[PDB]
Structure formats: structure tokens, C-alpha cells
Design a protein around this ligand. Structure first.
Ligand SMILES: COc1cccc(CN)c1
Ligand SMILES: [Ca+2]
Length: 223
């Protein structure tokens, strides 16, 4: 997260870190046994880390649970990043509490201008590289479909939305991938793509979760 703030430990209880020997992506806990992430975050050997603030230190609220299965969306296209969503099932159910908690799926899609919270452990520089140990947060509005399409001609599908600031300076970044965009207590987005971080006229692009609720529910009910 570029241009954000330190969230504060365990203030984003659905936020998870996906670890394959190191943090590589974020995710969102949506029930005791399942995580939503980006399809581009797919790899084998994933351990889900919940209850994290400083990802380099054991601080006492963590649960580390290996994934038993990953399910990438059937329609994910890695080139276009259309349908950039994946589910990850935990080997064991997480113990839910104030600091480890699920986030509700959307019942409605959020509109442009809605204010959301985007979070992650990704790079904090628009030009350099600095990775924070503690969770970073950004408050950002959903952008209009027209402005998003104008920003990225030819690339925005009905399964994507833009959020952020056309002026630059505040954005998601590498390693934030897969993480949450939450608006009014519901997971409306997944950190997906962009062109660099925090550049003018290149806001972040997010998977449009409301489009996937039926798939998510059905998949969970049978797996
Ligand atoms: C270029 O790498 C990125 C990864 C996640 C999100 C974004 C959006 N600025 C960019
Ligand atoms: Ca930790």
C-alpha cells in the first residue's frame, strides 16, 4: 500500500497473509474454513496466516493453517486477468474471535463513489521498494466505470472495478495482491492489477466480488 496508514494490530481481522515460505499475497477470510484471494496468487504449498500484524514476528494472535485445496475460477484468464478470483480451503477451521473474523460477502454491488478500505503488506513506494512488516491500510473510493475504462482503454471487463485516486500517490501495490477491498462491512473487491503503483491516471483495478457470490457459495457448499 502506497500512501496509506498503519492499520493497527488486528484491526482488520479478516485480512490474511498467504505464505509459501514468505508472504506472497493477501486474502480474506469469509468463513472459518475458507479464504478468497486472487487467481493470480495461485501456487502450491500455501499456508494461510491469520491474526497477523507484523508478518516477521510472532506476536501472539496468529493461527497458521495449511491449505488443503485451492480452486481457481473456471473462467480465469491469466492474460487479461478477467475473473481474477480463487478460493482456498483450510485444512482445519480457524478459531474465530475479535482478531480473527470472517468478512461477509456482498448482497449488492457497491457503486462508484462508495468509500472502501484496502489493506495489505505490499510495497509502500511508487518508485522504490520498501516492504512493511506491519499491515497497511488505505481508504479509497470506487471510481466510475467510465473513468476506469478511460484510464485503461481496452482492458476493463464487467468483472473489474477501479478504486483509488486519479491524481496518484495513494494505491495498492505488489504484495497487496489478493487482498481485500471492503466497503460498508462487505468484501466488494480483491486486489488484482494496475500499471505500477500510485501513478497519475493509473488507479488500482479490483476483481468485482459481487459478480461471484453465487459461484463462491455453491463452491463452498460442495467442497
Ligand atoms: C503492479 O503491481 C500491482 C499489484 C497489485 C496492485 C497494483 C495496483 N497499483 C499493482
Ligand atoms: Ca506475526
Amino acid at each position: 500500500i502506497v500512501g496509506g496508514y498503519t492499520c493497527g494490530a488486528n484491526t482488520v481481522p479478516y485480512q490474511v497473509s498467504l505464505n509459501s515460505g514468505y508472504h506472497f499475497c493477501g486474502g480474506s477470510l469469509i468463513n472459518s474454513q475458507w479464504v478468497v484471494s486472487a487467481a493470480h496468487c495461485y501456487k502450491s504449498g500455501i499456508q494461510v496466516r491469520l491474526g497477523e500484524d507484523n508478518i516477521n514476528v510472532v506476536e501472539g494472535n496468529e493461527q497458521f493453517i495449511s491449505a488443503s485445496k485451492s480452486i481457481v475460477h473456471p473462467s480465469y484468464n491469466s492474460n487479461t486477468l478477467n475473473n481474477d478470483i480463487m478460493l482456498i480451503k483450510l485444512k482445519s477451521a480457524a478459531s474465530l474471535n475479535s482478531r480473527v473474523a470472517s468478512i461477509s460477502l456482498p448482497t449488492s454491488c457497491a457503486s462508484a463513489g462508495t468509500q472502501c478500505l484496502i489493506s495489505g503488506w505490499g510495497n509502500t513506494k511508487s518508485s522504490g521498494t520498501s516492504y512493511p512488516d506491519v499491515l497497511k491500510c488505505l481508504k479509497a473510493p470506487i471510481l466510475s466505470d467510465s473513468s476506469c475504462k478511460s484510464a485503461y482503454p481496452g482492458q476493463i471487463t464487467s468483472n473489474m472495478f477501479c478504486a483509488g485516486y486519479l491524481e496518484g500517490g495513494k494505491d495498492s501495490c505488489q504484495g497487496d495482491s489478493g487482498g481485500p477491498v471492503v466497503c460498508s462491512g462487505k468484501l466488494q473487491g480483491i486486489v488484482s492489477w494496475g500499471s505500477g503503483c500510485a501513478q497519475k491516471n493509473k488507479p488500482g483495478v479490483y476483481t468485482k466480488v459481487c459478480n461471484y457470490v453465487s459461484w463462491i457459495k455453491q463452491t463452498i457448499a460442495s467442497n
